[PDB]
Amino acid sequence: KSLGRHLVAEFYECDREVLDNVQLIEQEMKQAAYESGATIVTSTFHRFLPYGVSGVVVI
Amino acid sequence: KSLGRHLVAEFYECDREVLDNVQLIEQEMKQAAYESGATIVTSTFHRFLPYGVSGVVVI
Amino acid sequence: XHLTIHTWPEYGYAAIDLFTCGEDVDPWKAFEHLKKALKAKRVHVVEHERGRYDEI
Amino acid sequence: XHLTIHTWPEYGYAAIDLFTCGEDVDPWKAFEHLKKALKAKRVHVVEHERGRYDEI
C-alpha cells in the first residue's frame, strides 16, 4: 500500500522518572524496535537539560 | 500553543541523483537546520545499498 | 526507518514517532512496548501512510 | 526536536519530517531549503501540533 507506516503518538501522564532517564529510554526504545521486528542501524540518545530526553533509533 | 511544530512531508519527483548522495543530503539537512535556527545536537546519516539514504539531525 | 522520542518530564508528556517500512515490520508492536514502558495513561495516535504506491 | 529524511531514489521520493520546538524555530524554513535543494516538483505536507498546552 505504501513504502512505510508511520505512527505519530502523543503520550500523556507517563512515569516521570522514566521520562527523565536517558539510559532507560534508550533501552526501552531499542527493545521497542526489536518487538516491531525491525533491524536497528544506529541509535543516539541525549539528555536535555534540565529535565528531558531526546533520542532516535534508525532502522 | 504546543511544545512543538511537526511537518510530515511527502516529497515527489525529486532529483534522483541528490536523493542518492549521502554527503549532499547531510549537507542540505544541516543547512535546513541552520535556516530554521535550530541548534544541532547531533547528526547521523547512512547510505543503504543499492539505493537510499537515511539521515537524522537531532535538534 | 526510525523511532524517535522527545520527553518533557515536567509535564509527564512524550512525543513519539514510529515510522517503519516492510510488511514484516509492525509499528504497533513498538507502540505497545513503549506504552507499557512509559506507564502512559492517555494516548493519541495518528497513522500516516508514507509513500503511497498510487502517489509515487 | 528533530529533522529526518529517508529517500527512495528509484522513486524520486523522500519522506521528510521537520519536528521543531520553540517560537524562534520555524520548521517551514527547513522545508523551503529542502524543497529547493532536492528539486521536488510535488509535495504534500501535514503540520502537527506536538504537545498542545490544553492537552498537557
UniProtKB/Swiss-Prot annotation, chains A, B:
It comes from Thermotoga maritima (strain ATCC 43589 / DSM 3109 / JCM 10099 / NBRC 100826 / MSB8). Signal peptide: none annotated. Changing S54A: Cleaves more rapidly than the wild-type. The chain holds residues 2 to 60 of 130 of the full protein. It comes from the Bacteria. Coiled coil: none annotated. This is S-adenosylmethionine decarboxylase beta chain.
UniProtKB/Swiss-Prot annotation, chains C, D:
The active site is at H6 (proton acceptor), C21 (proton donor). Changing H6A: Cleaves much more slowly than the wild-type, but the addition of hydroxylamine which is known to cleave ester bonds leads to the cleavage of this mutant. It comes from the Bacteria. This is S-adenosylmethionine decarboxylase alpha chain. The lineage of its organism: Bacteria, Thermotogati, Thermotogota, Thermotogae, Thermotogales. The gene is speH. The chain holds residues 64 to 118 of 130 of the full protein.
